[PDB]
Amino acid sequence: QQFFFENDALGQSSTDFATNFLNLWDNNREQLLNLYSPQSQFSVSVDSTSIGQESINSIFKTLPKTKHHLQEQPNEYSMETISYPQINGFVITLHGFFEETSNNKLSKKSFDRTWVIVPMNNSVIIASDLLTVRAYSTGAWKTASIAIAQAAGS
Amino acid sequence: NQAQITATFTKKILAHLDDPDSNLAQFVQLFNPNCRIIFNATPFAQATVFLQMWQNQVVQTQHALTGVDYHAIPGSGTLICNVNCKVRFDWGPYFGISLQLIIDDRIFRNDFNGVISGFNYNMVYKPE
Ligand SMILES: [Hg+2]
């Protein structure tokens, strides 16, 4: 329920969500499976520059350990949230970078992850999780404002 | 199978954003009468207003697919695409664009009239 999702006009829920998700994604991905259902779907890809808690868990354990800096370096990420009327849910997309660890070294990497969420049980179920990892680069969205660049449509 | 159908339509869409001919009307026909569109952080309730802004304000563009994922969500009766492109404007350097789209199944059954209900278009990166 720490993933309780309200659709506040302030975009705070979208931020809590992304924060709590990544945190666990960085320290305890296993705990994220609760948010996935038998019919949930996950996919990753890499830019020229999996279904059900199990399969999804599988590759989750595969994917390299990481470290995001959403709360410390907010400005380094942008976010849009749109309603998904058809499933009485929402789509949250987060653009930014994280620190990637196979040559045992730490490299920066940009990405765009899109979570399709359907609020429920004072929480949410992730219907779709589309991750696109790409060559690190500075977000073409930054401003003097030290904070996530938000946008919401509905 | 279904794979292709999508990636192609994805392109069709990109094709339109690239076509300068203010003759556009059938493009707007890809969006139904109830939307959700964001462009570079800017919302638009009507694909009309948006496309108007585009043809009227945006410059000549050149889009190139470089990643296209998607999930068809069960019961929803639609699917969602996680697209990636680069773009040029006059032709200059390449910019990075991230694009999510919510589209209707119907397309898989060749139906193209107003199937775009989700349009999240955002530039993620630019020249070095
Ligand atoms: Hg619309």
Side-chain angles (χ1 to χ4, degrees), chain A residues 41-43 45 47 80 83-87 93 95 112 114 116 128 130 132 134 137 139-141 152 154, chain B residues 36 38 41 43 66 69-73 76 78-80 82 84 98 100 102 117 120 122-126:
Chain A
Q41 308 182 67
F42 183 68
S43 286
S45 47
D47 189 340
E80 310 78 40
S83 71
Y84 205 154
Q86 301 92 314
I87 60 190
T93 287
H95 309 281
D112 309 301
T114 315
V116 159
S128 163
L130 294 164
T132 290
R134 72 174 193 274
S137 51
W141 60 73
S154 59
Chain B
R36 263 137 273 104
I38 293 187
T66 76
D69 255 317
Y70 85 83
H71 289 166
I73 299 186
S76 85
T78 52
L79 71 111
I80 187 182
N82 191 43
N84 297 274
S98 186
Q100 296 65 45
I102 299 187
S117 24
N120 191 24
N122 293 293
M123 175 186 275
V124 284
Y125 72 77
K126 31 185 177 58

mmCIF file of all heavy atoms in Angstrom, chain A residues 41-43 45 47 80 83-87 93 95 112 114 116 128 130 132 134 137 139-141 152 154, chain B residues 36 38 41 43 66 69-73 76 78-80 82 84 98 100 102 117 120 122-126:
data_model
loop_
_atom_site.group_PDB
_atom_site.id
_atom_site.type_symbol
_atom_site.label_atom_id
_atom_site.label_comp_id
_atom_site.label_asym_id
_atom_site.label_seq_id
_atom_site.Cartn_x
_atom_site.Cartn_y
_atom_site.Cartn_z
ATOM 1 N N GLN A 41 2.944 -7.764 -17.749
ATOM 2 C CA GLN A 41 3.942 -7.956 -18.800
ATOM 3 C C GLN A 41 5.150 -7.034 -18.618
ATOM 4 O O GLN A 41 5.006 -5.874 -18.232
ATOM 5 C CB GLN A 41 3.318 -7.686 -20.171
ATOM 6 C CG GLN A 41 2.033 -8.444 -20.452
ATOM 7 C CD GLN A 41 1.499 -8.168 -21.855
ATOM 8 O OE1 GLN A 41 2.118 -8.557 -22.843
ATOM 9 N NE2 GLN A 41 0.356 -7.483 -21.945
ATOM 10 N N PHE A 42 6.342 -7.551 -18.899
ATOM 11 C CA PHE A 42 7.557 -6.752 -18.786
ATOM 12 C C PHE A 42 8.416 -6.920 -20.030
ATOM 13 O O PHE A 42 8.513 -8.011 -20.580
ATOM 14 C CB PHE A 42 8.381 -7.152 -17.555
ATOM 15 C CG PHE A 42 9.620 -6.308 -17.358
ATOM 16 C CD1 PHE A 42 9.517 -4.959 -17.020
ATOM 17 C CD2 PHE A 42 10.886 -6.851 -17.544
ATOM 18 C CE1 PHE A 42 10.655 -4.158 -16.870
ATOM 19 C CE2 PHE A 42 12.036 -6.060 -17.395
ATOM 20 C CZ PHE A 42 11.914 -4.707 -17.059
ATOM 21 N N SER A 43 9.037 -5.832 -20.469
ATOM 22 C CA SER A 43 9.896 -5.884 -21.643
ATOM 23 C C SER A 43 11.001 -4.857 -21.584
ATOM 24 O O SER A 43 10.806 -3.751 -21.098
ATOM 25 C CB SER A 43 9.086 -5.676 -22.925
ATOM 26 O OG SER A 43 8.320 -6.831 -23.230
ATOM 27 N N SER A 45 14.662 -3.310 -23.779
ATOM 28 C CA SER A 45 15.291 -3.214 -25.067
ATOM 29 C C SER A 45 16.399 -2.205 -24.990
ATOM 30 O O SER A 45 16.478 -1.394 -24.052
ATOM 31 C CB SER A 45 14.266 -2.832 -26.132
ATOM 32 O OG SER A 45 13.476 -1.751 -25.691
ATOM 33 N N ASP A 47 18.801 0.669 -27.302
ATOM 34 C CA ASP A 47 18.707 1.545 -28.443
ATOM 35 C C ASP A 47 20.039 1.656 -29.160
ATOM 36 O O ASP A 47 21.062 2.151 -28.712
ATOM 37 C CB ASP A 47 18.226 2.932 -28.025
ATOM 38 C CG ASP A 47 17.903 3.807 -29.219
ATOM 39 O OD1 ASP A 47 18.394 3.502 -30.327
ATOM 40 O OD2 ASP A 47 17.160 4.795 -29.049
ATOM 41 N N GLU A 80 5.886 12.089 -17.226
ATOM 42 C CA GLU A 80 4.562 12.392 -17.731
ATOM 43 C C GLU A 80 3.615 11.311 -17.212
ATOM 44 O O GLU A 80 4.004 10.140 -17.045
ATOM 45 C CB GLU A 80 4.538 12.388 -19.256
ATOM 46 C CG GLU A 80 5.623 13.207 -19.918
ATOM 47 C CD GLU A 80 6.953 12.501 -19.918
ATOM 48 O OE1 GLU A 80 6.967 11.273 -20.133
ATOM 49 O OE2 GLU A 80 7.986 13.175 -19.715
ATOM 50 N N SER A 83 -3.972 9.496 -18.194
ATOM 51 C CA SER A 83 -4.983 8.556 -17.790
ATOM 52 C C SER A 83 -5.083 7.467 -18.842
ATOM 53 O O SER A 83 -4.773 7.683 -20.018
ATOM 54 C CB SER A 83 -6.328 9.251 -17.653
ATOM 55 O OG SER A 83 -6.819 9.596 -18.930
ATOM 56 N N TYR A 84 -5.490 6.288 -18.397
ATOM 57 C CA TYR A 84 -5.673 5.158 -19.282
ATOM 58 C C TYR A 84 -7.104 4.740 -18.977
ATOM 59 O O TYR A 84 -7.360 3.756 -18.276
ATOM 60 C CB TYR A 84 -4.680 4.056 -18.944
ATOM 61 C CG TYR A 84 -4.374 3.153 -20.110
ATOM 62 C CD1 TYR A 84 -3.159 2.477 -20.182
ATOM 63 C CD2 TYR A 84 -5.311 2.945 -21.122
ATOM 64 C CE1 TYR A 84 -2.880 1.610 -21.230
ATOM 65 C CE2 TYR A 84 -5.049 2.082 -22.171
ATOM 66 C CZ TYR A 84 -3.830 1.407 -22.221
ATOM 67 O OH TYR A 84 -3.586 0.481 -23.220
ATOM 68 N N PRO A 85 -8.058 5.527 -19.494
ATOM 69 C CA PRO A 85 -9.500 5.350 -19.337
ATOM 70 C C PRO A 85 -9.936 3.907 -19.492
ATOM 71 O O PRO A 85 -10.646 3.370 -18.640
ATOM 72 C CB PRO A 85 -10.075 6.237 -20.438
ATOM 73 C CG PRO A 85 -9.069 7.319 -20.555
ATOM 74 C CD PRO A 85 -7.772 6.563 -20.505
ATOM 75 N N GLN A 86 -9.495 3.290 -20.582
ATOM 76 C CA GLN A 86 -9.855 1.922 -20.916
ATOM 77 C C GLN A 86 -9.622 0.859 -19.860
ATOM 78 O O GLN A 86 -10.233 -0.206 -19.920
ATOM 79 C CB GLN A 86 -9.165 1.521 -22.214
ATOM 80 C CG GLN A 86 -9.533 2.422 -23.379
ATOM 81 C CD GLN A 86 -8.570 3.589 -23.567
ATOM 82 O OE1 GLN A 86 -8.191 4.284 -22.613
ATOM 83 N NE2 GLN A 86 -8.174 3.813 -24.812
ATOM 84 N N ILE A 87 -8.746 1.121 -18.900
ATOM 85 C CA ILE A 87 -8.502 0.149 -17.837
ATOM 86 C C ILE A 87 -8.596 0.844 -16.502
ATOM 87 O O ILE A 87 -8.021 0.375 -15.509
ATOM 88 C CB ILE A 87 -7.116 -0.448 -17.910
ATOM 89 C CG1 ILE A 87 -6.081 0.674 -17.779
ATOM 90 C CG2 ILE A 87 -6.974 -1.258 -19.179
ATOM 91 C CD1 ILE A 87 -4.667 0.247 -18.085
ATOM 92 N N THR A 93 5.360 7.545 -17.161
ATOM 93 C CA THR A 93 6.599 7.398 -17.890
ATOM 94 C C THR A 93 7.636 8.245 -17.207
ATOM 95 O O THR A 93 7.382 9.408 -16.857
ATOM 96 C CB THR A 93 6.474 7.878 -19.325
ATOM 97 O OG1 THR A 93 5.710 6.930 -20.073
ATOM 98 C CG2 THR A 93 7.850 8.014 -19.948
ATOM 99 N N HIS A 95 11.723 9.473 -17.541
ATOM 100 C CA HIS A 95 12.929 9.628 -18.345
ATOM 101 C C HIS A 95 14.066 10.056 -17.405
ATOM 102 O O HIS A 95 13.858 10.885 -16.506
ATOM 103 C CB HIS A 95 12.705 10.709 -19.402
ATOM 104 C CG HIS A 95 11.457 10.515 -20.207
ATOM 105 N ND1 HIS A 95 11.372 9.616 -21.252
ATOM 106 C CD2 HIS A 95 10.234 11.092 -20.110
ATOM 107 C CE1 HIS A 95 10.154 9.649 -21.766
ATOM 108 N NE2 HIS A 95 9.443 10.537 -21.091
ATOM 109 N N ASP A 112 14.204 5.269 -20.462
ATOM 110 C CA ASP A 112 12.816 5.729 -20.499
ATOM 111 C C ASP A 112 12.018 4.496 -20.065
ATOM 112 O O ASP A 112 11.941 3.510 -20.825
ATOM 113 C CB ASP A 112 12.367 6.101 -21.917
ATOM 114 C CG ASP A 112 13.314 7.058 -22.618
ATOM 115 O OD1 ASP A 112 13.563 8.184 -22.106
ATOM 116 O OD2 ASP A 112 13.797 6.673 -23.708
ATOM 117 N N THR A 114 8.292 2.963 -18.834
ATOM 118 C CA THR A 114 6.867 3.287 -18.841
ATOM 119 C C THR A 114 6.007 2.245 -18.119
ATOM 120 O O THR A 114 5.865 1.107 -18.584
ATOM 121 C CB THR A 114 6.358 3.411 -20.272
ATOM 122 O OG1 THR A 114 7.294 4.180 -21.039
ATOM 123 C CG2 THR A 114 5.000 4.094 -20.287
ATOM 124 N N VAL A 116 2.373 1.012 -16.860
ATOM 125 C CA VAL A 116 0.943 1.133 -17.041
ATOM 126 C C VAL A 116 0.386 0.608 -15.732
ATOM 127 O O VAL A 116 0.594 -0.555 -15.383
ATOM 128 C CB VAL A 116 0.427 0.259 -18.162
ATOM 129 C CG1 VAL A 116 -1.083 0.028 -17.972
ATOM 130 C CG2 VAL A 116 0.692 0.940 -19.497
ATOM 131 N N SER A 128 1.644 -3.191 -17.310
ATOM 132 C CA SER A 128 2.728 -3.198 -18.285
ATOM 133 C C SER A 128 3.957 -2.412 -17.805
ATOM 134 O O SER A 128 3.833 -1.330 -17.225
ATOM 135 C CB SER A 128 2.214 -2.631 -19.610
ATOM 136 O OG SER A 128 3.291 -2.268 -20.444
ATOM 137 N N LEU A 130 7.426 -1.276 -19.535
ATOM 138 C CA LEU A 130 8.280 -1.183 -20.713
ATOM 139 C C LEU A 130 9.527 -0.343 -20.448
ATOM 140 O O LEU A 130 9.452 0.889 -20.332
ATOM 141 C CB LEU A 130 7.486 -0.602 -21.899
ATOM 142 C CG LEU A 130 6.343 -1.509 -22.393
ATOM 143 C CD1 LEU A 130 5.376 -0.740 -23.257
ATOM 144 C CD2 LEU A 130 6.902 -2.689 -23.168
ATOM 145 N N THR A 132 13.386 0.891 -21.618
ATOM 146 C CA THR A 132 14.239 1.075 -22.780
ATOM 147 C C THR A 132 15.522 1.678 -22.248
ATOM 148 O O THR A 132 15.544 2.833 -21.805
ATOM 149 C CB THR A 132 13.632 2.064 -23.784
ATOM 150 O OG1 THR A 132 12.483 1.472 -24.407
ATOM 151 C CG2 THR A 132 14.668 2.469 -24.838
ATOM 152 N N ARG A 134 19.301 3.073 -22.772
ATOM 153 C CA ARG A 134 20.035 3.713 -23.856
ATOM 154 C C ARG A 134 21.302 4.425 -23.387
ATOM 155 O O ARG A 134 21.520 4.616 -22.187
ATOM 156 C CB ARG A 134 19.124 4.706 -24.616
ATOM 157 C CG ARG A 134 18.782 5.985 -23.856
ATOM 158 C CD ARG A 134 17.995 6.981 -24.725
ATOM 159 N NE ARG A 134 17.943 8.310 -24.109
ATOM 160 C CZ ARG A 134 17.038 8.697 -23.212
ATOM 161 N NH1 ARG A 134 16.084 7.859 -22.825
ATOM 162 N NH2 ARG A 134 17.110 9.913 -22.671
ATOM 163 N N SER A 137 23.162 10.242 -21.631
ATOM 164 C CA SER A 137 23.241 11.582 -22.197
ATOM 165 C C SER A 137 22.411 12.505 -21.313
ATOM 166 O O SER A 137 21.492 12.066 -20.629
ATOM 167 C CB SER A 137 22.714 11.598 -23.632
ATOM 168 O OG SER A 137 21.441 10.997 -23.684
ATOM 169 N N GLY A 139 19.669 14.963 -20.079
ATOM 170 C CA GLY A 139 18.271 15.148 -20.436
ATOM 171 C C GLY A 139 17.974 16.480 -21.103
ATOM 172 O O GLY A 139 18.148 17.545 -20.500
ATOM 173 N N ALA A 140 17.514 16.422 -22.349
ATOM 174 C CA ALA A 140 17.195 17.628 -23.110
ATOM 175 C C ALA A 140 16.055 18.409 -22.474
ATOM 176 O O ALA A 140 15.538 19.350 -23.073
ATOM 177 C CB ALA A 140 16.817 17.254 -24.544
ATOM 178 N N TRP A 141 15.678 18.035 -21.255
ATOM 179 C CA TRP A 141 14.566 18.683 -20.572
ATOM 180 C C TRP A 141 14.916 19.609 -19.401
ATOM 181 O O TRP A 141 14.109 20.457 -19.011
ATOM 182 C CB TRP A 141 13.603 17.600 -20.080
ATOM 183 C CG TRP A 141 14.240 16.627 -19.120
ATOM 184 C CD1 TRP A 141 14.593 16.868 -17.819
ATOM 185 C CD2 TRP A 141 14.636 15.274 -19.400
ATOM 186 N NE1 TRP A 141 15.177 15.745 -17.271
ATOM 187 C CE2 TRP A 141 15.207 14.751 -18.214
ATOM 188 C CE3 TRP A 141 14.538 14.446 -20.525
ATOM 189 C CZ2 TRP A 141 15.709 13.450 -18.134
ATOM 190 C CZ3 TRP A 141 15.037 13.143 -20.444
ATOM 191 C CH2 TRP A 141 15.603 12.659 -19.253
ATOM 192 N N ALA A 152 1.172 16.073 -16.980
ATOM 193 C CA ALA A 152 0.061 15.184 -16.743
ATOM 194 C C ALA A 152 -1.005 15.581 -17.726
ATOM 195 O O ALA A 152 -1.225 16.761 -17.963
ATOM 196 C CB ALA A 152 -0.445 15.354 -15.329
ATOM 197 N N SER A 154 -5.097 14.382 -19.257
ATOM 198 C CA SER A 154 -6.296 13.583 -19.031
ATOM 199 C C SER A 154 -7.507 14.268 -19.633
ATOM 200 O O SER A 154 -8.488 14.500 -18.933
ATOM 201 C CB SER A 154 -6.521 13.356 -17.533
ATOM 202 O OG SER A 154 -6.660 14.595 -16.849
ATOM 203 N N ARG B 36 -5.677 12.206 -25.105
ATOM 204 C CA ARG B 36 -4.690 12.461 -24.093
ATOM 205 C C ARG B 36 -3.415 12.546 -24.919
ATOM 206 O O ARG B 36 -2.946 11.551 -25.476
ATOM 207 C CB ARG B 36 -4.660 11.318 -23.091
ATOM 208 C CG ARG B 36 -5.485 11.623 -21.864
ATOM 209 C CD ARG B 36 -6.332 10.441 -21.414
ATOM 210 N NE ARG B 36 -7.635 10.380 -22.077
ATOM 211 C CZ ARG B 36 -7.939 9.534 -23.053
ATOM 212 N NH1 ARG B 36 -7.033 8.664 -23.493
ATOM 213 N NH2 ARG B 36 -9.150 9.558 -23.589
ATOM 214 N N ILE B 38 0.480 14.681 -25.031
ATOM 215 C CA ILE B 38 1.472 15.549 -24.442
ATOM 216 C C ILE B 38 2.569 15.661 -25.478
ATOM 217 O O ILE B 38 2.923 14.670 -26.133
ATOM 218 C CB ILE B 38 2.088 14.982 -23.137
ATOM 219 C CG1 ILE B 38 1.031 14.933 -22.031
ATOM 220 C CG2 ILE B 38 3.221 15.905 -22.650
ATOM 221 C CD1 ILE B 38 1.585 14.537 -20.662
ATOM 222 N N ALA B 41 6.157 18.289 -22.942
ATOM 223 C CA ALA B 41 5.539 18.632 -21.624
ATOM 224 C C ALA B 41 4.207 19.338 -21.774
ATOM 225 O O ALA B 41 3.561 19.663 -20.798
ATOM 226 C CB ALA B 41 6.492 19.510 -20.828
ATOM 227 N N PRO B 43 0.323 19.612 -22.758
ATOM 228 C CA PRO B 43 -0.904 18.847 -23.041
ATOM 229 C C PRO B 43 -1.742 19.453 -24.180
ATOM 230 O O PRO B 43 -1.620 20.645 -24.498
ATOM 231 C CB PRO B 43 -1.667 18.874 -21.708
ATOM 232 C CG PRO B 43 -0.626 19.333 -20.665
ATOM 233 C CD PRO B 43 0.259 20.276 -21.444
ATOM 234 N N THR B 66 14.092 3.480 -33.800
ATOM 235 C CA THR B 66 15.325 2.933 -33.233
ATOM 236 C C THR B 66 15.001 2.104 -31.993
ATOM 237 O O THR B 66 15.844 1.913 -31.108
ATOM 238 C CB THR B 66 16.330 4.052 -32.829
ATOM 239 O OG1 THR B 66 15.912 4.683 -31.610
ATOM 240 C CG2 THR B 66 16.412 5.095 -33.908
ATOM 241 N N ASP B 69 8.716 -1.142 -28.620
ATOM 242 C CA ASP B 69 8.151 -2.179 -27.777
ATOM 243 C C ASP B 69 6.659 -1.968 -27.645
ATOM 244 O O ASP B 69 6.152 -0.908 -27.989
ATOM 245 C CB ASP B 69 8.768 -2.117 -26.397
ATOM 246 C CG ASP B 69 9.758 -3.208 -26.167
ATOM 247 O OD1 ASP B 69 9.446 -4.352 -26.569
ATOM 248 O OD2 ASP B 69 10.826 -2.920 -25.572
ATOM 249 N N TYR B 70 5.955 -2.976 -27.147
ATOM 250 C CA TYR B 70 4.523 -2.848 -26.958
ATOM 251 C C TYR B 70 3.926 -4.047 -26.243
ATOM 252 O O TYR B 70 4.443 -5.159 -26.309
ATOM 253 C CB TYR B 70 3.816 -2.630 -28.304
ATOM 254 C CG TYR B 70 3.497 -3.896 -29.072
ATOM 255 C CD1 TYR B 70 2.350 -4.650 -28.783
ATOM 256 C CD2 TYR B 70 4.336 -4.340 -30.096
ATOM 257 C CE1 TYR B 70 2.049 -5.818 -29.505
ATOM 258 C CE2 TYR B 70 4.046 -5.503 -30.824
ATOM 259 C CZ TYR B 70 2.907 -6.237 -30.527
ATOM 260 O OH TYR B 70 2.631 -7.378 -31.254
ATOM 261 N N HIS B 71 2.821 -3.790 -25.560
ATOM 262 C CA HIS B 71 2.090 -4.791 -24.815
ATOM 263 C C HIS B 71 0.633 -4.575 -25.153
ATOM 264 O O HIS B 71 0.181 -3.433 -25.265
ATOM 265 C CB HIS B 71 2.269 -4.585 -23.312
ATOM 266 C CG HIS B 71 3.634 -4.921 -22.806
ATOM 267 N ND1 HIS B 71 4.073 -4.541 -21.555
ATOM 268 C CD2 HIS B 71 4.653 -5.611 -23.369
ATOM 269 C CE1 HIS B 71 5.305 -4.981 -21.371
ATOM 270 N NE2 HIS B 71 5.680 -5.634 -22.457
ATOM 271 N N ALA B 72 -0.107 -5.664 -25.341
ATOM 272 C CA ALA B 72 -1.526 -5.534 -25.629
ATOM 273 C C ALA B 72 -2.159 -5.835 -24.294
ATOM 274 O O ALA B 72 -1.999 -6.938 -23.761
ATOM 275 C CB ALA B 72 -1.945 -6.543 -26.651
ATOM 276 N N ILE B 73 -2.830 -4.845 -23.729
ATOM 277 C CA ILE B 73 -3.436 -5.037 -22.430
ATOM 278 C C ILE B 73 -4.841 -5.624 -22.500
ATOM 279 O O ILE B 73 -5.728 -5.038 -23.124
ATOM 280 C CB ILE B 73 -3.437 -3.704 -21.650
ATOM 281 C CG1 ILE B 73 -1.991 -3.231 -21.457
ATOM 282 C CG2 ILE B 73 -4.140 -3.878 -20.307
ATOM 283 C CD1 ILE B 73 -1.838 -2.004 -20.583
ATOM 284 N N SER B 76 -8.638 -4.313 -21.850
ATOM 285 C CA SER B 76 -8.561 -2.907 -22.210
ATOM 286 C C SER B 76 -9.084 -2.786 -23.631
ATOM 287 O O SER B 76 -9.885 -1.895 -23.941
ATOM 288 C CB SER B 76 -7.109 -2.415 -22.164
ATOM 289 O OG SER B 76 -6.398 -2.675 -23.379
ATOM 290 N N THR B 78 -6.914 -2.618 -26.143
ATOM 291 C CA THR B 78 -5.911 -1.779 -26.770
ATOM 292 C C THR B 78 -4.531 -2.248 -26.391
ATOM 293 O O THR B 78 -4.364 -3.209 -25.645
ATOM 294 C CB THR B 78 -6.036 -0.303 -26.318
ATOM 295 O OG1 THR B 78 -6.051 -0.245 -24.883
ATOM 296 C CG2 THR B 78 -7.310 0.341 -26.885
ATOM 297 N N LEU B 79 -3.541 -1.536 -26.904
ATOM 298 C CA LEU B 79 -2.154 -1.847 -26.650
ATOM 299 C C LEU B 79 -1.376 -0.548 -26.427
ATOM 300 O O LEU B 79 -1.863 0.555 -26.703
ATOM 301 C CB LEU B 79 -1.591 -2.601 -27.844
ATOM 302 C CG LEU B 79 -1.408 -1.748 -29.097
ATOM 303 C CD1 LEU B 79 0.095 -1.588 -29.329
ATOM 304 C CD2 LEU B 79 -2.087 -2.387 -30.304
ATOM 305 N N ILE B 80 -0.161 -0.681 -25.922
ATOM 306 C CA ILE B 80 0.661 0.481 -25.663
ATOM 307 C C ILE B 80 2.057 0.252 -26.218
ATOM 308 O O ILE B 80 2.671 -0.788 -26.000
ATOM 309 C CB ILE B 80 0.729 0.788 -24.144
ATOM 310 C CG1 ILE B 80 1.452 2.126 -23.914
ATOM 311 C CG2 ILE B 80 1.411 -0.365 -23.401
ATOM 312 C CD1 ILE B 80 1.605 2.492 -22.450
ATOM 313 N N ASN B 82 6.086 1.603 -26.766
ATOM 314 C CA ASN B 82 7.169 2.378 -26.186
ATOM 315 C C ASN B 82 8.154 2.611 -27.312
ATOM 316 O O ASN B 82 9.036 1.787 -27.574
ATOM 317 C CB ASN B 82 7.842 1.609 -25.070
ATOM 318 C CG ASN B 82 8.779 2.464 -24.295
ATOM 319 O OD1 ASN B 82 8.453 3.601 -23.976
ATOM 320 N ND2 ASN B 82 9.953 1.933 -23.974
ATOM 321 N N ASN B 84 11.034 4.811 -29.743
ATOM 322 C CA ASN B 84 12.272 5.586 -29.698
ATOM 323 C C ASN B 84 12.701 6.020 -31.108
ATOM 324 O O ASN B 84 12.727 5.219 -32.045
ATOM 325 C CB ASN B 84 13.361 4.753 -29.047
ATOM 326 C CG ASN B 84 13.027 4.411 -27.622
ATOM 327 O OD1 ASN B 84 13.301 5.189 -26.702
ATOM 328 N ND2 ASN B 84 12.401 3.252 -27.427
ATOM 329 N N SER B 98 11.413 10.148 -27.250
ATOM 330 C CA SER B 98 10.800 8.991 -26.607
ATOM 331 C C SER B 98 9.299 9.174 -26.857
ATOM 332 O O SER B 98 8.754 10.268 -26.671
ATOM 333 C CB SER B 98 11.093 8.976 -25.102
ATOM 334 O OG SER B 98 10.611 7.776 -24.514
ATOM 335 N N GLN B 100 5.391 7.262 -26.340
ATOM 336 C CA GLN B 100 4.471 6.213 -25.913
ATOM 337 C C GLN B 100 3.160 6.483 -26.654
ATOM 338 O O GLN B 100 2.817 7.643 -26.912
ATOM 339 C CB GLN B 100 4.224 6.272 -24.409
ATOM 340 C CG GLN B 100 5.449 6.008 -23.546
ATOM 341 C CD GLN B 100 6.513 7.074 -23.702
ATOM 342 O OE1 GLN B 100 6.210 8.273 -23.700
ATOM 343 N NE2 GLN B 100 7.770 6.649 -23.835
ATOM 344 N N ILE B 102 -1.038 4.800 -27.074
ATOM 345 C CA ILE B 102 -2.042 3.826 -26.675
ATOM 346 C C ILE B 102 -2.841 3.676 -27.949
ATOM 347 O O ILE B 102 -3.347 4.666 -28.488
ATOM 348 C CB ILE B 102 -2.922 4.341 -25.523
ATOM 349 C CG1 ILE B 102 -2.029 4.629 -24.306
ATOM 350 C CG2 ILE B 102 -3.975 3.305 -25.174
ATOM 351 C CD1 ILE B 102 -2.755 4.985 -23.052
ATOM 352 N N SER B 117 -5.238 7.048 -28.824
ATOM 353 C CA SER B 117 -5.886 7.709 -27.693
ATOM 354 C C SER B 117 -4.804 8.177 -26.742
ATOM 355 O O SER B 117 -5.061 8.969 -25.833
ATOM 356 C CB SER B 117 -6.844 6.752 -26.970
ATOM 357 O OG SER B 117 -6.490 5.387 -27.167
ATOM 358 N N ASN B 120 2.235 10.373 -26.034
ATOM 359 C CA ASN B 120 3.201 11.044 -25.190
ATOM 360 C C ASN B 120 4.494 11.129 -25.969
ATOM 361 O O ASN B 120 5.250 10.151 -26.063
ATOM 362 C CB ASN B 120 3.401 10.294 -23.875
ATOM 363 C CG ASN B 120 4.199 11.107 -22.848
ATOM 364 O OD1 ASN B 120 4.248 12.348 -22.900
ATOM 365 N ND2 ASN B 120 4.817 10.407 -21.895
ATOM 366 N N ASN B 122 8.038 13.113 -26.316
ATOM 367 C CA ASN B 122 8.993 13.966 -25.606
ATOM 368 C C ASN B 122 10.429 13.807 -26.035
ATOM 369 O O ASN B 122 10.932 12.688 -26.163
ATOM 370 C CB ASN B 122 8.928 13.719 -24.105
ATOM 371 C CG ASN B 122 7.625 14.160 -23.516
ATOM 372 O OD1 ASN B 122 7.329 15.355 -23.479
ATOM 373 N ND2 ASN B 122 6.816 13.195 -23.065
ATOM 374 N N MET B 123 11.096 14.937 -26.238
ATOM 375 C CA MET B 123 12.487 14.906 -26.631
ATOM 376 C C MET B 123 13.322 14.585 -25.388
ATOM 377 O O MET B 123 13.276 15.310 -24.392
ATOM 378 C CB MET B 123 12.894 16.251 -27.213
ATOM 379 C CG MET B 123 14.378 16.344 -27.537
ATOM 380 S SD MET B 123 14.847 17.999 -28.073
ATOM 381 C CE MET B 123 14.424 17.873 -29.851
ATOM 382 N N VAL B 124 14.079 13.496 -25.440
ATOM 383 C CA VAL B 124 14.892 13.110 -24.302
ATOM 384 C C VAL B 124 16.327 13.611 -24.391
ATOM 385 O O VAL B 124 16.962 13.889 -23.364
ATOM 386 C CB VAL B 124 14.892 11.592 -24.115
ATOM 387 C CG1 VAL B 124 13.582 11.159 -23.511
ATOM 388 C CG2 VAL B 124 15.100 10.907 -25.445
ATOM 389 N N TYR B 125 16.848 13.730 -25.608
ATOM 390 C CA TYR B 125 18.211 14.226 -25.760
ATOM 391 C C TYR B 125 18.474 14.958 -27.076
ATOM 392 O O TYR B 125 17.713 14.853 -28.046
ATOM 393 C CB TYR B 125 19.232 13.084 -25.578
ATOM 394 C CG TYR B 125 19.296 12.083 -26.717
ATOM 395 C CD1 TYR B 125 19.949 12.390 -27.915
ATOM 396 C CD2 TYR B 125 18.687 10.831 -26.603
ATOM 397 C CE1 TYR B 125 19.989 11.476 -28.969
ATOM 398 C CE2 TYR B 125 18.721 9.914 -27.649
ATOM 399 C CZ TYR B 125 19.369 10.242 -28.829
ATOM 400 O OH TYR B 125 19.361 9.340 -29.869
ATOM 401 N N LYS B 126 19.558 15.722 -27.077
ATOM 402 C CA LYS B 126 19.965 16.476 -28.241
ATOM 403 C C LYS B 126 21.475 16.368 -28.467
ATOM 404 O O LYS B 126 22.197 15.827 -27.629
ATOM 405 C CB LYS B 126 19.520 17.939 -28.097
ATOM 406 C CG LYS B 126 19.465 18.508 -26.693
ATOM 407 C CD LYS B 126 18.890 19.930 -26.760
ATOM 408 C CE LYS B 126 18.732 20.575 -25.395
ATOM 409 N NZ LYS B 126 20.024 20.637 -24.656
#
